[PDB]
């Protein structure tokens, strides 16, 4: 089931992670949400980035009216977009993915991202050649308006995604901190296992929460399409065949086991329901031992403009 955060609210350990494409029709993350949820998913991870909240909130709430689950079994998680990093931009941003979900708290709020944006309402502002324009932000005082929409009981708990161990200790180091992240949602997976930001993390009691555990949606976009597929690692495939799981699942279940709290998205009804079953076998000592030893420092995440950025995140590569 959950994990306690260092600000003594609760989270399930596996999160479905709700971004689609926009060649994806936007009321299909209603449909699947639904799915999710009536398939045992508590924990759901938007954000305004995705341009879903209004649709996942919609689910969220269907299933609250029908008498399935009352709004505290339930873990929803948004993120502040890069464009409104500046401390008086923060709260305008959460209460309008509360409007757009129709939500009067969210679970998690979280930094996005390090790598701030020009302010204003495009998410991807760009220049007279079609560049992405950076801003420069001091985070900390992000953190300040972020800890105050806690207090405000606009989100029940806060946190960061895309840190790097440098930039938690900067929060971390800060004068007069209120609240320490109770997560850092980050790219994790068997061939990116983060295993030193992770023993950082435990040391501090933050919880490391893993995105594309799967090896993501290979947006041609953002991911090069000739990098190596995950879920086809023979590894996971022969560990699939002793448990008589599937790549997936065993991705999914080592992340648990590394006490790594685990997203992981589908729009596919079948596939949603089977994720769940993560719970239901175990890895031994000597499978979880095997998967380390995958390790490639492989992010999926490739992007020249994002990588330039002064607090892109993997910027010691490079
Ligand atoms: N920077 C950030 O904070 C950040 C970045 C990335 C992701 N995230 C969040 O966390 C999630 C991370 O996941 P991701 O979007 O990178 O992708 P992912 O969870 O790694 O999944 C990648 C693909 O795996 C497929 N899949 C799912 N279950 C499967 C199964 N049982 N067997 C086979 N294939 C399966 C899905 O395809 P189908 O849809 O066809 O099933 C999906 O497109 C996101 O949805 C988002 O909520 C956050
Ligand atoms: C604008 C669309 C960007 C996009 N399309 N395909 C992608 C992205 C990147 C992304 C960045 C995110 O916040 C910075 C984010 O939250 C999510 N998400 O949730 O799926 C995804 C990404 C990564 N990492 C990878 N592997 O694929």
């Known amino acids: 089931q959950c994990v306690k955060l260092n600000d003594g609210h609760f989270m399930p350990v596996l999160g479905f992670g709700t971004y689609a494409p ?3 029709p936007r009321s299909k993350a209603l449909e699947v949400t639904k799915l999710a949820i009536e398939a045992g998913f508590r924990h759901i991870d938007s954000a305004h980035l995705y341009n879903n909240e209004e649709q996942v909130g919609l689910a969220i709430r269907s299933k609250i009216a029908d008498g399935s689950v009352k709004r505290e ?3 929803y998680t948004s993120k502040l977009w890069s464009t409104f990093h500046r401390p008086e931009l923060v709260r305008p941003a959460l209460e309008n993915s509360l409007k757009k979900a129709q939500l009067d708290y969210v679970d998690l709020y979280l930094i996005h991202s390090p790598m701030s ?3 204003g309402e495009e998410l991807s502002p760009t220049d007279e050649n079609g560049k992405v324009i950076f801003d420069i932000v001091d985070l900390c005082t992000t953190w300040e308006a972020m800890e105050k929409c806690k207090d405000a009981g606009l989100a029940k708990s806060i946190g960061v995604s895309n840190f790097n161990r440098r930039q938690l200790e900067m929060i971390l180091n800060k004068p007069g901190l209120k609240y320490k992240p ?6 994790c997976h068997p061939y990116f296992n983060r295993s030193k930001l992770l023993d950082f993390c435990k040391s501090k009691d933050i919880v490391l929460v893993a995105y594309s555990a799967l090896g993501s949606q290979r ?3 953002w991911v090069d399409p000739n990098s190596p597929v995950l879920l086809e690692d023979p590894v996971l495939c022969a560990l699939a065949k002793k448990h008589k799981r599937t790549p997936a699942l065993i991705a999914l279940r080592y ?5 790594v709290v685990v997203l992981a998205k589908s729009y596919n009804e079948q596939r949603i329901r089977q994720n769940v079953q993560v719970f239901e076998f175990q890895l031994t000592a000597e499978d979880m031992k095997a998967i380390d030893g995958l390790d490639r420092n492989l992010h999926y995440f490739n992007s020249d403009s994002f990588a330039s950025h002064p607090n892109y995140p993997y910027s010691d590569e490079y």
Not at 255 to 259: A, F, K, N, V
């Open 22 to 24: 926009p060649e994806v």
């Open 73 to 75: 079994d339930i873990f």
């Open 117 to 119: 944006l020009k302010p």
């Open 182 to 187: 109770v997560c850092n949602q980050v790219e």
């Open 219 to 221: 947006d041609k976009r």
């Open 255 to 259: 992340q648990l086991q590394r006490g």
